[PDB]
Swiss-Prot record, chains A, B:
Belongs to the DtxR/MntR family. Iron-binding repressor of the dipheteria toxin gene expression. May serve as a global regulator of gene expression. Represses ripA under iron excess. InterPro entries: DtxR/IdeR_SH3 (IPR040767), DtxR_MntR_Metal-Reg (IPR050536), Fe_dep_repressor (IPR001367), Fe_dep_repressor_sf (IPR036421), FeoA_core_dom (IPR038157), HTH_DTXR (IPR022687), Iron_dep_repressor (IPR022689), Transcriptional_repressor_C (IPR008988). This is Diphtheria toxin repressor. Its main location: cytoplasm. Homodimer. The keyword Transcription regulation applies. Pfam families: DtxR, Fe_dep_repr_C, Fe_dep_repress. GO terms for cellular component: cytoplasm. The gene is dtxR. SUPFAM superfamilies: C-terminal domain of transcriptional repressors (SSF50037), Iron-dependent repressor protein, dimerization domain (SSF47979), Winged helix' DNA-binding domain (SSF46785). Transmembrane segments: none annotated.
């Protein structure tokens, strides 16, 4: 019982972060269709197991081990969805639910085979990047990690820019003095309410952020 | 926890029958690497759930519902093994263990797709017929069912036979006055210690059996 449950809590926190939603226990209860009390019980165990910390604001911060496990479950889940759609041909309306089960029993080595056999594993069939593939086998340029983080805009410093076409991109995605997600890819891209601005490097080095 | 466990007990009983072994609780404990007491506890629940009867000789007789479920789990298991070998290309030494997990989470509709996509679903990669495909979508000729049963030879009646090449087949598979398995296929075949004699109809109507 217990292992699949933990993984589901983890993938759900992972999911909410990808969606920009604060990982709150009531948000997890609602999404998993579980009671709040029930969720509190599992989260308590997960804290005990070192997988999550409940911050003073009641959000759930996955620890590095928790996040590794979350990432793995998300990876299996999305690879299973790929397998089910691409090869098996299961009706798309059933694919998620099936992968909801298969994600807890797919081995790493099966994953590795899927990566060999599938045409593309960039994205699930539902449009989301498949993470953790590598593991399977302050200025923005300095501050971003290979792990999504929300930060606060403290300076944009347009005045120092030569290229200006991204000024309007920033205005259109609404930040100026706000709280944005930051990541390094193949680098740097910023997000704010499901609107992404992929920064060119000159901007990535002048934009400054803080926690928080 | 409980559903996968029940299915495993069921597939194991199914297995022992296919192998000609009396479904004894100590044989199930040994095969599942579970304690006897532990197995007694689950079997008791399974009796309560209507899936098995413990006969006076201590063998486990699957009820019709139990057998249907056993057959389904065996089917998913073997189809999963096919999928893993044929398409996925998982190392054959890992295929069983993986299917040991996937058998408990594969839906009927995924099965139906597998039957569409796979080259042949007659047999698992380990040489055993895949059952339950139809469900997914006394003289021997009269006594045999579409379900394996052991019976006792009461008469062979060679004297009434025109064709005699199967006389030696019977002698070679060692029966004469013994306890044999009987089944109807595409009919009738008899088995005795992993030696099969597929009867021609003239013999199937003269050979007589009893319980038991
Ligand atoms: Ni999904
Ligand atoms: Ni799941
Ligand atoms: Ni097997
Ligand atoms: Ni199993």
């Amino acid at each position: 019982d217990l292992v699949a449950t933990t993984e589901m809590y983890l993938r759900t926190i992972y999911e909410l972060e990808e969606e920009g939603v604060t990982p709150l226990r009531a948000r997890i209860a609602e999404r998993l269709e579980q009671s709040g009390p029930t969720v509190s019980q599992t989260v308590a165990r997960m804290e005990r197991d070192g997988l999550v910390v409940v911050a003073s604001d009641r959000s759930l911060q996955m620890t590095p081990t928790g996040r590794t496990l979350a990432t793995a479950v998300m990876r299996k889940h999305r690879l299973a969805e790929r397998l089910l759609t691409d090869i098996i041909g299961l009706d798309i309306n059933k694919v998620h639910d099936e992968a909801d089960r298969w994600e807890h029993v797919m081995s790493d080595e099966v994953e590795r085979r899927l990566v060999k056999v599938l045409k593309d594993v960039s994205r699930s069939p539902f449009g989301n990047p498949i993470p953790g593939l590598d593991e399977l086998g302050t200025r923005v340029i300095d501050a971003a990690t290979s792990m999504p983080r929300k930060v606060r805009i403290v300076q944009i410093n347009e005045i120092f820019q030569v290229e200006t076409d991204q000024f309007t991109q920033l205005l259109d995605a609404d930040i100026r003095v706000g709280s944005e997600v930051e990541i390094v890819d193949r680098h740097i891209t910023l997000s704010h309410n499901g609107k992404d601005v992929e920064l060119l490097d000159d901007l990535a080095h002048t934009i400054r952020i803080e926690e928080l």
